[PDB]
Design a protein around this ligand. Sequence first.
Ligand code: IN7
Ligand code: CA
Ligand code: CA
Ligand code: CA
Ligand code: ZN
Ligand code: ZN
Length: 167
Amino acid sequence: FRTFPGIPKWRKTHLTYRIVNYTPDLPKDAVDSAVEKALKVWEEVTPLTFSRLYEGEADIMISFAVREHGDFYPFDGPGNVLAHAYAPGPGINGDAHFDDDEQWTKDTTGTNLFLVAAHEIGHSLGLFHSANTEALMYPLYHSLTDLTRFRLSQDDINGIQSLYGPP
Ligand SMILES: O=C(O)CNS(=O)(=O)c1ccc(N2CCC(c3ccccc3)CC2)cc1
Ligand SMILES: [Ca+2]
Ligand SMILES: [Ca+2]
Ligand SMILES: [Ca+2]
Ligand SMILES: [Zn+2]
Ligand SMILES: [Zn+2]
């Protein structure tokens, strides 16, 4: 595993998130479902808990956007960068943005929202890229033949517990 430079981490175990807006591609229940499953993956292996805000500033602001969208890294149209997220801290730190020029899916065929969200939340928590080709935090996107076979690798677990400890 790898962490970010200077090891940013949250110094608190109760985090909040807000889904500020929604993709055209999926019903809202499918996107809520994807992000809460993505939160849950990390919750199980740490002492962190997440709760949702419907207004105000949450720690992790989640949104869908195209091209230039209010930070230093505009999205780039279809393909290439699918999403990005910032390391722990105030303001834009912690946040995750998804490129809505992708076509988001629930299935194993397109660009799957759950797999990407789980990866991005790894960033939001302080993890950078892994060299393990098994790891969630591997730098190159791919999906699975069967989503029910999804699991965190030992590397992702070792990485995240280095920051926050076990549950
Ligand atoms: O976030 C960045 O770094 C930059 N954005 S990006 O759009 O290039 C990017 C987005 C996602 C991934 N993923 C890595 C592998 C993965 C996975 C892992 C195990 C089993 C199934 C699927 C699913 C997400 C990698 C890069
Ligand atoms: Ca934030
Ligand atoms: Ca893109
Ligand atoms: Ca889209
Ligand atoms: Zn952004
Ligand atoms: Zn990444």
